């Protein structure tokens, strides 16, 4: 039907970012062609952005195609979502094509689509007490204990939110109803649901304990000393404060890993500001678990990206990359207090101090006659990988305060980044580099005379390339947090989606993209020399 500029016209117009505008004359040429479109499932998410949802007489035929339409990807269904869409038939739609994505994927997109409840019909959920979105999240986790952990976690936390409960006294209504419709459900279901229901609660009340420690040992005013003998005599006291010794509880940071208390003995206050809690959990596998817990702390933030972290790393594994990378879990359990996952690592600013370079730390505890100079060629493998994504991962995100504190290594030659309090751009100081590379990074590697050195960009090629084809999936998820009370996203909600969207260059063709991606690589480099 439509000719071959047409065509041309369309398929550029199909390949847009799912935040970007169209223009009046491209809402035209896409109602024109609805028909035709019809056949591209790629093309349903912008017919539906083209239509007029106050009349009804559109609203109607709009929706005789949306039956028509070959049925979008599932992944594409999370723009359906968004703030963009008030027509129930049109988000019943985009949960219909969720209920076809497997529990590990839902878990990917579940802190998003948590988000995405403020946007769903509040009177519905309350007169709970054909699916949309919060009978779709409750019924997918009474079938599946971790996806019913993270809603618990991801829920209740939005129901501690003051800022919501002040803010919005509507949405905070409605994540307390949304609660409740959770707890209803379990309670009403099987014995396996059930026990699933006492089992969040006893999680709930062990944190509760926990936190109630931290505080105990912050009315202390000894040193940091007299503070960790405070918290160990404490966690040893299980007549007291029962967290020695505990029956079977799922960790609500790995909820897949259960554990019976925390070792007492090896309890230790970080030496910053806000003291947080080095703690190893006793795991039911007899092993050892250790955590961070922070207290008096807002840890979204760094939830939110430790999640698109983790995301970005199963899609390149996907595509059978896998680039050694450390997406330690991160949970809040509230919106002043939460768990990391602790990885054993050295800050690179500490392997300076100690031992010089990164080299010579790789030299000591991983030699190699025959290796890069000197280093087991194994080690050195994973660095140069885990360099790449990272340097690619923290690119897209616009990662901020990149000094050698929040960078960490281990014996293994994995490098990671930590400490995710300037995202999409911020920074401490002005004028951040678009690419913050360090010094002390590429001579990790051998310098930039080093073969290593272009394996390291060959792989920040391919991983750019591969995170490129899944703009669409990571731009949705972002759109679905511009709501959310997060700070870096909080200063400016109606451009944060763009600030991701720019890094992609989805303008550059692949070739292109390469091109400038190894420019903006080699200036940063050539600018740190
Ligand atoms: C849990 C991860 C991964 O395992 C190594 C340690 N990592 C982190 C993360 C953070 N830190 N260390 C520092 C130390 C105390 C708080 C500060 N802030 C962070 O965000
Ligand atoms: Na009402
Ligand atoms: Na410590
Ligand atoms: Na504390
Ligand atoms: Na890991």
């Given at each position: 039907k439509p000719?071959?500029?047409?065509?041309?016209?369309?398929?550029?117009?199909?390949?847009?970012?799912?935040?970007?505008?169209?223009?009046?004359?491209?809402?035209?040429?896409?109602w024109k062609?609805?028909?035709?479109?019809?056949?591209?499932?790629?093309?349903?998410?912008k017919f539906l952005?083209?239509?007029?949802?106050?009349?009804?007489?559109?609203?109607?035929?709009?929706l005789?195609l949306?039956?028509?339409?070959?049925?979008?990807?599932?992944?594409?269904?999370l723009?359906?979502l968004?703030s963009?869409?008030?027509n129930?038939?049109?988000?019943?739609?985009?949960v219909?094509?969720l209920r076809?994505?497997?529990?590990?994927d839902?878990?990917?997109?579940?802190?998003?689509?948590?988000?995405?409840?403020?946007?769903?019909?509040?009177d519905?959920?309350?007169?709970?007490?054909?699916?949309?979105?919060?009978?779709?999240?409750?019924s997918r986790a009474?079938?599946?204990?971790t996806?019913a952990?993270?809603?618990?976690?991801y829920?209740?936390?939005?129901?501690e939110?003051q800022?919501?409960?002040?803010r919005?006294p509507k949405?905070?209504?409605m994540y307390?109803?949304?609660?409740?419709?959770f707890?209803q459900?379990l309670?009403?279901?099987?014995?396996?649901?059930?026990?699933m229901?006492?089992?969040?609660?006893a999680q709930?009340?062990?944190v509760?304990?926990?936190?109630?420690?931290?505080?105990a040992?912050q009315?202390?005013?000894?040193?940091?000393?007299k503070?960790?003998?405070?918290?160990?005599?404490l966690?040893?006291?299980?007549?007291?404060?029962?967290?020695s010794?505990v029956?079977?509880?799922?960790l609500?940071?790995e909820?897949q890993?259960?554990?019976?208390?925390?070792?007492?003995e090896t309890?230790?206050?970080?030496?910053?500001?806000?003291?947080?809690?080095?703690?190893?959990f006793?795991?039911?596998?007899?092993?050892?678990?250790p955590?961070?817990?922070?207290?008096?702390?807002?840890l979204?933030?760094?939830?939110l990206?430790?999640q698109?972290?983790?995301?970005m790393?199963?899609?390149?594994?996907?595509?059978?990359?896998?680039?050694?990378?450390?997406?330690?879990k991160?949970?809040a359990?509230?919106?002043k207090?939460?768990?990391?996952?602790?990885?054993?690592?050295?800050?690179?600013?500490?392997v300076?101090?100690?031992?010089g370079?990164?080299?010579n730390?790789?030299?000591k505890?991983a030699?190699?006659?025959?290796?890069?100079?000197?280093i087991?060629?194994?080690?050195?493998?994973?660095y140069?990988?885990?360099?790449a994504?990272?340097?690619?991962?923290?690119?897209?995100?616009?990662?901020?305060?990149?000094?050698l504190?929040?960078?960490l290594?281990?014996?293994?030659?994995k490098?990671?980044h930590?400490d995710?309090?300037?995202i999409?751009?911020?920074?401490?100081?002005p004028?951040?580099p678009?690419?913050?590379?360090?010094?002390?990074?590429?001579?990790g590697?051998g310098?930039?005379q080093?073969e290593?050195?272009?394996?390291?960009?060959?792989?920040?090629?391919?991983?750019?390339?591969?995170?490129?084809?899944?703009?669409?999936?990571?731009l949705?998820?972002?759109?679905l947090?511009?709501?959310a009370?997060?700070?870096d996203?909080?200063?400016?909600?109606?451009?944060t989606?763009?600030?991701?969207?720019?890094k992609?260059?989805?303008?550059?063709?692949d070739?292109?993209?390469?091109?400038?991606?190894?420019?903006?690589?080699?200036?940063?480099?050539?600018?740190?020399?």
């Amino acid at each position: 039907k439509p000719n071959a500029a047409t065509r041309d016209q369309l398929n550029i117009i199909v390949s847009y970012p799912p935040t970007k505008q169209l223009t009046y004359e491209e809402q035209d040429l896409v109602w024109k062609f609805r028909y035709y479109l019809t056949n591209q499932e790629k093309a349903l998410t912008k017919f539906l952005k083209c239509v007029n949802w106050d009349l009804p007489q559109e609203a109607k035929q709009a929706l005789e195609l949306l039956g028509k339409w070959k049925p979008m990807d599932v992944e594409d269904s999370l723009e359906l979502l968004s703030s963009h869409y008030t027509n129930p038939t049109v988000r019943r739609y985009a949960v219909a094509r969720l209920r076809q994505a497997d529990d590990e994927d839902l878990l990917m997109y579940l802190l998003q689509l948590v988000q995405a409840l403020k946007y769903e019909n509040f009177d519905d959920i309350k007169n709970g007490l054909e699916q949309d979105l919060c009978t779709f999240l409750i019924s997918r986790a009474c079938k599946n204990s971790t996806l019913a952990n993270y809603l618990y976690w991801y829920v209740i936390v939005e129901c501690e939110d003051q800022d919501t409960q002040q803010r919005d006294p509507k949405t905070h209504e409605m994540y307390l109803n949304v609660m409740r419709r959770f707890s209803q459900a379990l309670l009403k279901g099987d014995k396996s649901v059930r026990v699933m229901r006492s089992l969040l609660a006893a999680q709930q009340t062990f944190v509760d304990r926990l936190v109630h420690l931290m505080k105990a040992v912050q009315r202390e005013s000894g040193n940091r000393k007299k503070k960790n003998e405070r918290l160990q005599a404490l966690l040893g006291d299980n007549e007291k404060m029962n967290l020695s010794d505990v029956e079977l509880i799922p960790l609500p940071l790995e909820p897949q890993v259960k554990i019976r208390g925390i070792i007492p003995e090896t309890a230790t206050l970080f030496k910053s500001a806000l003291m947080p809690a080095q703690l190893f959990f006793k795991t039911e596998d007899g092993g050892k678990y250790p955590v961070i817990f922070k207290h008096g702390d807002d840890l979204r933030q760094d939830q939110l990206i430790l999640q698109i972290i983790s995301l970005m790393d199963k899609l390149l594994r996907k595509e059978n990359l896998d680039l050694k990378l450390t997406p330690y879990k991160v949970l809040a359990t509230s919106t002043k207090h939460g768990f990391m996952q602790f990885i054993q690592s050295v800050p690179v600013a500490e392997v300076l101090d100690t031992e010089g370079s990164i080299q010579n730390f790789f030299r000591k505890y991983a030699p190699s006659e025959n290796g890069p100079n000197g280093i087991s060629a194994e080690v050195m493998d994973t660095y140069v990988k885990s360099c790449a994504g990272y340097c690619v991962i923290t690119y897209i995100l616009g990662v901020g305060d990149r000094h050698l504190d929040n960078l960490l290594l281990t014996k293994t030659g994995k490098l990671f980044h930590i400490d995710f309090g300037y995202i999409l751009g911020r920074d401490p100081k002005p004028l951040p580099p678009p690419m913050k590379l360090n010094k002390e990074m590429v001579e990790g590697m051998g310098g930039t005379q080093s073969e290593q050195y272009q394996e390291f960009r060959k792989q920040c090629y391919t991983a750019f390339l591969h995170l490129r084809r899944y703009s669409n999936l990571i731009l949705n998820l972002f759109s679905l947090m511009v709501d959310a009370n997060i700070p870096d996203i909080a200063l400016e909600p109606d451009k944060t989606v763009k600030k991701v969207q720019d890094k992609f260059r989805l303008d550059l063709s692949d070739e292109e993209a390469v091109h400038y991606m190894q420019s903006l690589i080699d200036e940063s480099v050539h600018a740190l020399f």
